[PDB]
Amino acid sequence: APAVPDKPVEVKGSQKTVMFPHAPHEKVECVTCHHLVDGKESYAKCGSSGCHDDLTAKKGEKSLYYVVHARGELKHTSCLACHSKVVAEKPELKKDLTGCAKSKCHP
Ligand code: HEC
Ligand code: HEC
Ligand code: HEC
Ligand code: HEC
């Protein structure tokens, strides 16, 4: 597959941009986030046209916000869904991984 980015990359929303760092996720399988689409591999941007291209709505499969922040039952793992579990085991990282403000995602 392509080489994983070695510097934080930009995850553009409609107003905010959150930097995503691959290094701390080196042990997570690529497919967990870059999930298969139509049975095929894809490393395209999450908010690509035809993917999670609704950058303003809070819900719906097309909502980038939803695929990122939902803790609900999803077809794939969201950032918050996994972070909740990590935080359950490492409570000292609650603010860093799940905070809406002053977190590692939203400083
Ligand atoms: C606490 C539970 C949080 C609240 C409430 C919000 N976030 Fe986040 N967030 C993250 C990413 C990767 C993005 C960019 C992609 C996108 O969702 O569009 C954002 C963006 C926002 C936004 C603005 C949405 C927009 O610009 O269209 C809002 C209002 C927002 N977030 C609220 C990632 C993360 C993250 C990293 C794991 C955490 C802990 C949070 N966000 C927490 C919250
Ligand atoms: C979730 C925790 C992830 C894991 C595990 C991996 N990647 Fe990733 N990657 C993820 C995001 C949120 C982003 C930003 C996409 C965006 O919306 O901008 C990326 C980006 C990439 C890219 C660059 C594509 C691009 O954004 O233009 C590549 C080439 C990439 N990721 C590769 C990759 C590989 C090979 C992985 C496993 C070793 C891998 N990623 C894991 C989220 C996640
Ligand atoms: C288009 C080629 C896509 C890219 C690139 C990414 N996603 Fe996706 N995602 C896409 C579809 C067609 C679907 C529906 C389910 C399916 O697998 O066919 C999804 C689903 C998700 C989900 C679950 C959403 C739900 O409502 O259950 C999540 C959590 C999700 N996608 C996350 C995600 C992330 C973080 C991506 C970037 C690394 C990403 N997707 C890329 C289509 C596409
Ligand atoms: C589990 C399968 C994960 C998914 C999906 C996402 N993240 Fe993650 N993240 C995970 C771990 C194991 C860690 C490290 C915790 C530790 O023990 O130290 C992280 C860390 C981050 C961080 C913090 C890095 C730092 O600055 O210290 C960020 C900012 C982060 N993760 C972002 C992020 C985003 C935006 C995701 C969705 C695209 C995402 N993570 C998914 C585990 C998992």
Identify the CATH number of the domain in which residue 37 sits.
3.90.10.10
Say how many domains are in the chain: 1
Residue 57 lies in domain = 1-107
CA distances from 41 to 24, 32, 93, 94 (A): 22, 11, 32, 32
Kindly state the tokens that stand for 56. Answer: 């303003």
Element housing 31 (H / E)? helix 30-33
Q: 62-77: buried (b, 16+ CB within 10 Å) or exposed (e) per residue?
A: ebbbbbbbbeeeeeeb
Ligand nearest to the CA of 69: 1
**Is 29:22 a contact under the CB 8 Å cutoff?**
no
**Is 84:92 a contact under the CB 8 Å cutoff?**
no
d(CA 64, CA 83): 17
Secondary-structure percent of the chain, ordered helix, strand, coil, rounded to 5? 30, 10, 60
Residue 37 Cβ inside 6 Å of ligand 3? The answer reads yes
Residue 78 Cβ inside 6 Å of ligand 3? The answer reads yes
**CA nearest to 82, candidates 35, 50, 15:** 35
